[PDB]
Amino acid sequence: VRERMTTQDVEAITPQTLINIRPVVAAIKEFFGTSQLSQFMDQNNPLSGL
Amino acid sequence: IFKVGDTVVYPHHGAALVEAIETRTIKGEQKEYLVLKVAQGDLTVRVPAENAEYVGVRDVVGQEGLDKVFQVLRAPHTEEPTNWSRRYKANLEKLASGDVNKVAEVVRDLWRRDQERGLSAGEKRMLAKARQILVGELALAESTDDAKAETILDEVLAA
Amino acid sequence: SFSDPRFDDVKAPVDECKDKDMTYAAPLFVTAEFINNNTGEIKSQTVFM
């Protein structure tokens, strides 16, 4: 945003223009997939799930 | 001069409906803001009426501006700088000026050029945005029928 | 300056997502507001986060 806000022209930008949500959605997806904490949920009885 | 229910043109977001005159005082001064929304990105803009013309809010134009930009749209001998990036920067500044005649010049130039050649994706998106805001102003000026304004726009473009 | 997160309904129920291999999602919405300091405007939108 601060790389974009200074560079582009004033009285033409809008919050849709300044905001790139792609790092946010990529960050959540790379947490949920591919982290050592978001585990494949082990269930072969209810107790192992619990 | 701005009142509730008016229709006004805000640069560079085309048409704009005012909603109310916001009496939010701040810094000890009665900042008479006015909540003013567009239809493109659904963004509500509040500008104070003191510097509304300083930011360059502008009322819609009637039949004189209509046939004026029809004449400028019909105006032949459209010339351009030969460098395409100079051309693009020129029409970009003309579009960012927000003047309706400059918008008409830009859309008639880009329509005359891709109507002759078929230009670009960047020039295509340029023409799309400029045609969108000019169609919005012409739907405000003819007070109705954005699709009919589109059709009569494509009619007068062929002349 | 952002403001006010919000959630829609989920895009798909649980068993449908578990069948069709979609992730069980729900869309965010953030009321983002831009202010210009020198002239003074607000730009209140609804950014799909």
Curated annotation (Swiss-Prot), chain B:
Keywords of this protein's UniProt record, alphabetized? Virulence
SUPFAM superfamilies on file: CarD-like (SSF141259)
The answer on whether this UniProt entry bears the keyword Hydrolase reads: no
Q: Which Pfam families match?
A: CarD_C (PF21095), CarD_TRCF_RID (PF02559)
The protein's name:
RNA polymerase-binding transcription factor CarD
Enumerate the Gene3D superfamilies for this protein.
Answer: 2.40.10.170, CarD-like, C-terminal domain
Coiled-coil positions are none
Organism this protein belongs to: Mycobacterium tuberculosis (strain CDC 1551 / Oshkosh)
Q: Which family does it belong to?
A: Belongs to the CarD family.
Superkingdom, taxonomy of origin: Bacteria
Cross-referenced InterPro entries: CarD-like/TRCF_RID (IPR003711), CarD-like/TRCF_RID_sf (IPR036101), CarD-like_C (IPR042215), CarD-like_regulator (IPR052531), CarD_C (IPR048792)
UniProt entry tagged with the keyword Lyase: no
Outline what the protein does.
Controls rRNA transcription by binding to the RNA polymerase (RNAP). Required for replication and persistence during infection of mice.
Entry's Gene Ontology BP terms:
rRNA transcription
